[PDB]
Design a protein around this ligand. Structure first.
Ligand SMILES: Nc1ncnc2c1ncn2[C@@H]1O[C@H](COP(=O)(O)OP(=O)(O)OP(O)(O)=S)[C@@H](O)[C@H]1O
Lengths: 139, 1302, 140
């Protein structure tokens, strides 16, 4: 595949390796493999793969000691954009939302809420998109 | 004149007119230098004998301190002057002597002092220069003189000799310039090219003769043409003369060029592109490049001036333009120019913008020539384009990861094979970690194929046979024999010779093996620091010398195989070779005990494997060897596996092994090993909540019981105790000292045995004791609980300290005791004051350490400290009448220093005050070595001897300078509160001006200096740091006054800001200081607006000149690459270490780069934890990264593989977390150091500084900390650090500071 | 005393978990062939390759011992490596050439080369050959 494809899977293998810096280098390489600046793919599966790479990047950001929450949200938005339908993009966004929700609360239940409502809507969309993350989303 | 004497009385008769083992060695070092090469060979034979005579004692001279022995340093000088002989035999004898010496760690070697490669430039414009005329005379001498002996050559030679005699008077200033002697007798006797190389030009000399006729016409000057005509007769007479003539002819061609000659120059480039004779043509192209460099030097002289010369420079530029640097790099790749080729490739990228991928394919070839540790893989990481599968296999080789993917390189060969050699590389992968079974299958596959590589595989099989130690394996070696042998295969042949029992005939074969080593040695000769690069090849030669000793035993100094391995610097690749050599030696021995020894050698290899990781490979190595089982040895193999993974699971297996080992009997080391296993269990206990800390303490007591004597067991127990004591308080504090005292007693026992690790731990333990004493004084003032009860614990601790002191060695305390003393002075005094008196006794032991302490005491009002100094002086008077007198002499020297500090182009302050000059003249003050950062550091106690290694070593060991006084007028650098620098003549007579600047504190710099180079000592120890082979510069400041700190100026120091100003001047681009003022930033600048304005101004302000600066720094293309490597050493991990501290923020003007190799320096980085950054503007990048500076370091790619390696080095520094923690605690601890910026405290502290120490621990963690919430990776952190320097916005946030457009 | 029966018992079980328990249970660590049985329970090819190499270094009297190293080559799954192992094996097994040839034939199935298939096809083995005999049917 011209797209990273199995090489993108190799970046997942790098995640299996567990070295974030190597994984980050792989993530940049994967974006490059679809294009130096790849557009979301016209093929739905290729676009979904690009979204999956964005989800992997969000996991990498969570691994990173320093990450931008807005940047993670933008990657999540891009994943949602590649497939509104795909369960994985919504599920990754829901996981990002939960981390965002603890920060939004800032240790206060009252502070959390508008963000929580957006997260709940994303969780419902993710459950509709796929049942595989749906059981976790339902709890 | 002095020579080794057969008869002692004849030497004695010479000796009385001329006027213990080390002195003999000093005579030997003079002996090693030889007036006559034949005389040197006799000396070399004597030197090899002297080393043998030294025997174990020579090893004892070699080992005594962790710091390399000075006597070894004379020996190290002997190695520099050792096997470098034009005669092969002379070099071989020197090499044999080096083998008896064995291989010093490159990190261990301290000889960076010698000027070595650096020298005043040889190049001169020529013809006007006497040396160019001397060079023509040198060309006339030797082969032209041999040509003069031939009659046909002689008529041309005589005409040239007569022309040379007409050109230059034989006399007598010219005669004084001339070597004369036999040459003077010769002087009296004297009184764009297709045709070139191809066809008639043939092997260079014919081409040169055709070129010379064109050149004489081409040169504008009649005199240059006349010189060319004289050269042309000489060029016909000698091919070597023609080559010398061609560089001069090229300079004449540069001075005047015909348009046809310019086409001929293009033709010569085409001939170089078209290019034995081809190697000579490649050498001729290199000579043409060298002539171009000489032309560039002439162009630089033209550039230095301010017309026609500029037009000539433009014509040279046009010739350079006609040449294509990328084509030259491709020719250079054929040339195997390597770093010189890389510089041409870098020039091509500079010359014309290129696709990064297009540059990358050439770069990948360049990386292979470089043999860089990153190699192709570092280039690949820089590359944005995914590697070709063959390129990826090359990248895997560049990684040299080995292990997994060795098969993958074979798999690419499986998909298609174009090279038998590529298959052979797969076969090397098949050998993997020395696997015999894989080799046997490979050998059968190799046999079915017919290839030169298949024969090489048979040679590899012979190496496997050497591992086998099998007579049948020797028969396979015989099958290899009668076929060309690789040098490793030749080593296998030497093993075959051991089976042969050839003896002296085998030794002659060994001499042939030595000759192959000599070819490596010819590769070894090079610019300074080449020896560290060639040290591994030298180690293979050292292994051959050990094999020769083994051969002598078979035919039948201490030469322990283990001792030789310890002396050698240790690297994971180096260890694997050393283990193979040790295995071979065990294999050669037929002893059953030798077979048990071979298993022990495999175990030693396993310890090397633990250093090399590759734990599965190491387990494979244990399987490959095994037998001679040791319960501790099996446990150690399990422990290395445990460290890689499942350490607790391995520990449970280790406990079962311990049960097998012990039902009793210590059994020597094995009982100590059982204690070590208990220490590993204690680490496991810390790891597991189920493991009980009190139980672990009981285990620690048991480990102490197994060996009372071992320092390590006590030290480990003390470290466990210290963690336990903090845990027992659980932040309770309050009562703590009695528990701390039990931990201190374990630390003291560990200190009494002594350890290299122990000395760092002991300083931390002493610091903890000092903190406890301060706490007790505070408690007594508080009245909290019982002041007396706290005092009683403190008194018991003081009594323990006195007992510890008797065990303690002042040399063993070394630098740490002095650093502790500035922190040590306290208002409470009393028992702490008594501890200070013990510190004073250590101060008495080294005068220089006391002198440094005195200067700090002088700056402080130190009314209590001066009284303590007076008590120390009374102790010094008790120690010697002279010791008290020396302190008075030191005080007088300090007063002279104070006058220099006041500093009321070059100013004659010494002329201005008679007393300061008189004091310098007076010998009454004790002679003082000029302060050095190295001089300040104490010589390390030897790792090999736990106790008294420091005592045998100088507590600090260096040649000691005696002040010669200072010149009456010394030029002083001018600045507000400017430091004034004057140089005292050295006992050596080298003089360095040292300048003390108001608003600069020498003591604060000294505390930074003391932390500095702790890593450098660690780097010499680290294999990776040795692979970097990069020194870390240490600033030295010795000014007693707090207000002014005086540091001798570094030679070749360049301000980064000053260099940038010079670069702007070289560009001729002009930016007004007022124009920079004209650019305006709102204090509340929009972050986007400020960055956008900054970027536009920056791009115009600083097109990068860094690459040009690097080219100026080294003339050689290879030399420039070495300077680039020095730049890679510069900043990088050292910049990262400052970033991890968070303290520095050095001004770009403050930063200094050495002129010869460019080395990064940080000056007056007062801010700690970015206190300065917090003030005013704050800069995100940990280390300033000017874009132009980054581009010059980058060459083709700004990002540095060496910089990535530096981040790994920083991770190694993180690995020594405890040493770093002790240093951080010390910086806060010293009274002279200010945690938060001594009349106030005759006997600073920052709450933020304590938080900063927690931040430093966070830096060791590598956790971002700044990011909200939040998982730390050192490699990711290094990438983040590169990103922080990279961002324009981070530059926008910074105000002033580097203030650099690029 | 029970362990010797147990090692046989573990083999009958053909269960890794039972084998792992036996290894923990034994007072003395398994070595050589006993270590090799432990390696099969461990399931790690690199350890197995080392174990096979160590066993070969002590002695090389077993075609099966060579076969276990070949199994490690199968774990490597590199066609060039598998061929290299096969060539070495054919010379080494003068008594039983091609005993691991069927293993090589499975490698040939991995090779997916008809000519590679032909060399295996030329070889004749009185064995079921497991999947590889099916591969021989695949070969035409
Ligand atoms: N080897 C050296 N030669 C000359 N000046 C030096 C050297 N090392 C440090 N300096 C400092 O250079 C200063 C002269 O001004 P610059 O070269 O612009 O640097 P600076 O920023 O003032 O340097 P500091 O004082 O070290 S922050 C003096 O204040 C010196 O302290």
């Amino acid at each position: 595949s011209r797209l990273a494809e199995l090489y993108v899977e190799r970046a997942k293998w790098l995640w299996s390796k567990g070295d974030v810096h190597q994984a980050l280098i792989v993530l940049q390489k994967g974006v490059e493999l679809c294009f130096p600046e790849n557009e979301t793919p016209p093929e739905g599966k290729n676009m979904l793969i690009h979204g999956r790479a964005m989800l992997l990047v969000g996991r990498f950001m969570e691994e990173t000691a320093n990450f931008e929450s807005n940047a993670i949200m933008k990657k999540y938005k891009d994943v949602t954009a590649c497939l509104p339908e795909w369960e994985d993009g919504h599920f990754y966004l829901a996981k990002y939302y939960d981390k965002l929700m603890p920060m939004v609360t800032d240790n206060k239940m009252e502070k959390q809420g508008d963000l929580i409502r957006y997260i709940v809507l994303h969780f419902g969309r993710s459950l509709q998109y796929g049942n595989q993350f749906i059981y976790q989303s339902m709890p | 004149f002095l020579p080794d004497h057969p008869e002692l009385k004849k030497i004695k008769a010479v000796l009385q007119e001329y006027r213990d083992l080390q002195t003999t060695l000093q005579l030997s070092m003079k002996a090693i230098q030889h007036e006559n090469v034949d005389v040197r060979i006799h000396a070399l034979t004597s030197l090899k004998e002297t080393l043998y005579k030294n025997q174990e004692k020579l090893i004892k001279y070699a080992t005594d301190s962790e710091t390399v022995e000075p006597i070894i340093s004379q020996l190290v000088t002997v190695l520099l002057k050792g096997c470098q002989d034009a005669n092969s035999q002379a070099r071989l004898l020197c090499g044999e002597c080096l083998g008896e010496l064995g291989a010093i760690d490159p990190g261990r070697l301290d000889f960076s002092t010698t000027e070595t490669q650096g020298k005043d430039f040889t190049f001169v414009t020529g013809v006007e220069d006497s040396s160019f005329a001397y060079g023509l005379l040198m060309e006339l001498t030797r082969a032209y003189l041999a040509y003069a002996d031939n009659s046909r050559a002689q008529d041309s030679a005589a005409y040239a000799i007569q022309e040379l005699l007409s050109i230059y008077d034989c006399r007598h200033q010219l005669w004084r310039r001339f070597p004369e002697h036999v040459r003077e007798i010769l002087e009296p006797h004297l009184n764009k090219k297709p045709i070139y190389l191809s066809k008639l030009g043939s092997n260079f000399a014919e081409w040169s003769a055709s070129w010379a006729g064109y050149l004489i016409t081409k040169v504008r000057h009649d005199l240059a043409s006349k010189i060319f005509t004289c050269c042309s007769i000489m060029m016909k007479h000698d091919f070597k003369v023609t080559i010398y003539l061609l560089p001069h002819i090229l300079v004449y061609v540069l001075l005047g060029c015909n348009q046809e000659d310019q086409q001929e120059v293009y033709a010569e480039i085409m001939a170089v592109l078209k290019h034995i004779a081809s190697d000579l043509c490649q050498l001729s192209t290199q000579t043409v490049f060298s002539m171009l460099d000489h032309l560039t030097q002439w162009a630089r002289h033209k550039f230095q001036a301010l017309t026609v010369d500029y037009e000539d420079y433009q014509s040279v530029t046009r010739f350079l333009d006609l040449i294509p640097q990328d084509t030259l790099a491709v020719a250079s790749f054929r040339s195997k120019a390597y770093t010189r080729a890389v510089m041409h490739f870098e020039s091509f990228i500079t010359e014309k913008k290129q696709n990064i991928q297009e540059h990358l394919g050439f770069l990948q070839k360049l990386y292979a020539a470089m043999h860089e540790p990153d190699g192709v893989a570092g280039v690949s990481a820089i590359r944005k384009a995914e590697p070709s599968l063959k390129e990826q296999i090359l990248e895997h080789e560049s990684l040299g990861l080995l292990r997994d993917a060795t098969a993958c390189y074979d798999r690419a060969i499986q998909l298609e094979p174009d090279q038998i050699i590529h298959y052979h590389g797969v076969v090397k992968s098949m050998l993997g970690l020395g696997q015999l079974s894989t080799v046997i299958t490979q050998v059968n596959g190799v046999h079915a194929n017919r290839s030169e590589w298949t024969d090489e595989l048979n040679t590899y099989r012979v190496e496997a046979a050497w591992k086998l130690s099998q007579w049948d394996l020797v028969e396979n070696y015989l099958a290899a024999d009668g076929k060309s042998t690789t040098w490793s295969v030749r080593l296998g042949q030497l093993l075959l010779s051991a089976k042969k029992r050839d003896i002296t005939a085998f030794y002659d074969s060994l001499k042939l093996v030595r000759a192959e080593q000599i070819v490596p040695l010819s590769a070894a000769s090079f610019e300074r620091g080449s020896y560290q690069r060639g040290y591994e090849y030298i180690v293979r030669l050292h292994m051959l010398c050990e094999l020769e000793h083994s051969i002598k035993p078979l035919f039948q100094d201490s030469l322990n195989w283990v001792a030789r391995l310890e002396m050698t610097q240790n690297s994971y690749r180096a260890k694997e070779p050393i283990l193979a050599l040790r295995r071979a030696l065990l294999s050669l021995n037929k002893r059953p005990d030798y077979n048990e020894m071979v298993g022990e050698c495999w175990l030693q290899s396993a310890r090397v494997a633990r250093k090399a990781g590759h734990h599965q490979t190491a387990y494979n190595a244990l399987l490959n060897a095994g037998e001679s089982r040791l319960a501790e040895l099996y446990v150690e193999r399990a422990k290395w596996l445990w460290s890689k993974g499942d350490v607790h699971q391995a520990l449970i297996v280790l406990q079962k092994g311990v049960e097998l080992c012990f039902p009793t009997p210590p059994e020597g080391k094995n009982m100590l090993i059982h204690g070590r296993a208990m220490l590993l269990v204690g680490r496991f206990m810390e790891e597991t909540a189920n493991f009980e800390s009190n139980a672990i303490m009981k285990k620690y007591k048991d480990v102490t019981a197994c060996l009372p004597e071992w320092e390590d067991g006590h030290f480990y127990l003390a470290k466990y105790y210290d963690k336990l004591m903090p845990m027992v308080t659980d932040n309770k504090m309050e009562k703590q000292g009695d528990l701390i005292r039990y931990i201190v007693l374990h630390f003291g026992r560990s200190l009494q045995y002594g350890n290299q690790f122990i000395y760092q731990s002991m300083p931390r333990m002493l610091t903890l004791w000092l903190d406890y004493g301060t706490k007790a004084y505070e408690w007594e003032k508080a009245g909290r609980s019982d002041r007396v009860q706290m005092r009683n614990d403190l008194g018991k601790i003081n009594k323990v300290i006195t007992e510890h002191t008797n065990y303690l060695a002042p040399y063993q305390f070394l630098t740490a005791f002095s650093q502790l003393i500035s922190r040590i002075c306290h208002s409470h005094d009393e028992v702490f004051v008594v501890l200070m008196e013990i510190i004073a006794k250590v101060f008495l032991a080294y005068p220089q350490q006391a002198m440094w302490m005195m200067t700090a005491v002088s700056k402080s009002s130190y009314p209590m400290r001066v009284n303590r100094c007076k008590e120390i002086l009374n102790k010094a008077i008790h120690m010697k009448k002279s010791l008290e007198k020396f302190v008075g002499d030191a005080t007088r020297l300090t007063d002279k220093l104070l006058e220099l500090c006041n500093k009321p182009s070059t100013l004659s302050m010494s002329t201005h005050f008679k007393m300061l000059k008189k004091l310098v003249e007076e010998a009454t003050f004790s002679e003082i070595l000029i302060p050095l950062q190295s001089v300040m550091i104490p010589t390390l106690p030897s790792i090999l001897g736990t106790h008294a290694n420091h005592a045998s070593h100088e507590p600090f060991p260096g040649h000691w300078a005696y002040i010669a006084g200072f010149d009456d007028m010394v030029e002083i650098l001018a600045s507000l509160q400017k430091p004034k620098k004057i140089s005292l003549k050295g006992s050596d007579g080298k003089f360095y001006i040292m300048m003390c600047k108001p608003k600069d504190d020498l003591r604060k710099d000294c505390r930074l200096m003391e932390f500095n180079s702790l890593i450098n000592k660690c780097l010499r120890k680290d294999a990776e740091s040795r692979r970097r082979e990069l020194h870390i510069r240490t600033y030295a400041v010795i000014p007693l006054n707090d207000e002014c700190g005086i540091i001798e100026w570094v030679n070749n120091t360049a301000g980064l800001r000053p260099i940038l100003t010079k670069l702007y001047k070289e560009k001729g681009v002009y930016m007004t200081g007022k124009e920079l003022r004209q650019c305006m930033l709102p204090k509340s600048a929009a972050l986007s607006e400020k960055l956008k304005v900054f970027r536009e101004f920056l791009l115009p302000r600083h097109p990068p000149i860094f690459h040009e600066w690097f080219l100026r720094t080294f003339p050689d293309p290879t030399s420039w690459y070495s300077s680039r490597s020095a730049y890679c050493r510069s900043t990088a991990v050292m910049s990262m270490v400052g970033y991890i501290l968070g303290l520095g923020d050095r001004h770009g003007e403050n930063i200094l780069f050495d002129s010869l190799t460019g080395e990064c320096v940080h000056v007056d980085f007062n801010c700690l934890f970015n206190k300065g950054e917090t003030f005013e503007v704050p800069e995100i990048v940990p280390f300033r990264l000017t874009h132009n500076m980054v581009n010059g370091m980058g060459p083709m790619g700004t990002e540095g593989l060496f910089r990535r390696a530096c981040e790994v080095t920083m991770r190694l520094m993180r690995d020594q977390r405890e040493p770093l923690m002790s240093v951080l605690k010390t910086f806060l601890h010293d009274p002279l150091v200010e945690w938060s910026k001594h009349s106030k405290a005759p006997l600073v502290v920052n709450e933020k500084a304590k938080t900063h120490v927690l931040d430093i621990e966070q830096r060791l963690q590598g956790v971002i900390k700044t990011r909200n919430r939040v998982p730390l990776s050192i490699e990711g952190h290094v990438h983040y650090l590169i990103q922080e320097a990279t961002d324009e916005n981070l530059l926008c946030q910074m105000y002033l500071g580097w203030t650099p457009y690029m």
